[PDB]
Amino acid sequence: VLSEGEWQLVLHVWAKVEADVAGHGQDILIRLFKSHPETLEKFDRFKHLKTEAEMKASEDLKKHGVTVLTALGAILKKKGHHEAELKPLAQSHATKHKIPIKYLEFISEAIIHVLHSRHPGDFGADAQGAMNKALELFRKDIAAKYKELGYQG
């Protein structure tokens, strides 16, 4: 469970992200795909992209980055009281998109890295640890739903 002080660190940096949701979403997805190419293969929508320049040029990838970060921002702003938001996300991710929990770990690392690059003054070690806790809570709760459905592994 995050403390109130930890949530304030998380949401303080997240308010900075929302100034340029789309640029963050591009950086995060591109980092994810570069660092962990097995993740790109899960997207029929994106798997034609073969270079970082092609990824950066894709408007559809930019659009999806906004979809992803909007859903995550709505979850973070619930400060843990996010059941209604995770149900459908866990359902689609386990049963339709077939995304292992480990890949959620990967994108969590990408999110932390991009926040650090873009917001160093609001993403010192205290805020990095708090955001890591928030993303762990997200993964923990999604993993419980995956396990319910027979997908935790």
Pick the stretch among 1-9, 63-71, 113-121, 125-133 that binds ligand HEM (CB under 6 A).
Answer: 63-71
- 3-state percent helix, strand, coil for the chain, nearest multiple of 5: 75, 0, 25
Choose, by CB under 6 A, the member of 39, 55, 58, 115 that binds ligand HEM.
39
**Which tokens go with 14?**
């997240």
Task: Name every residue whose Cβ is closer than 8 Å to that of residue 89 and which is 6 or more positions away in sequence.
Answer: 71, 142
**Which tokens go with 99?**
């995304």
By CB under 6 A, residue 86 contacts ligand HEM: no
By CB under 6 A, residue 67 contacts ligand HEM: yes
Helix-helix angle 21-35:59-76, to 10 degrees: 100
* Other Cβ atoms closer than 10 A to 6: 19
Question: For residues 12 and 134, what is the distance between their CA atoms, to the nearest angstrom?
Answer: 13
By CB under 6 A, residue 42 contacts ligand HEM: yes
Name which of 123 and 138 has its Cβ closer to ligand HEM: 138
Choose, by CB under 6 A, the member of 61, 68, 90, 94 that binds ligand HEM.
68
Choose, by CB under 6 A, the member of 9, 10, 17, 99 that binds ligand HEM.
99
Pick the stretch among 14-22, 50-58, 103-111, 120-128 that binds ligand HEM (CB under 6 A).
Answer: 103-111
By CB under 6 A, residue 110 contacts ligand HEM: no
Helix-helix angle 125-149:101-118, to 10 degrees: 160
- Sites of contact with ligand HEM (CB under 6 A): 39, 42-43, 45, 67-68, 71-72, 89, 92-93, 97, 99, 103-104, 107
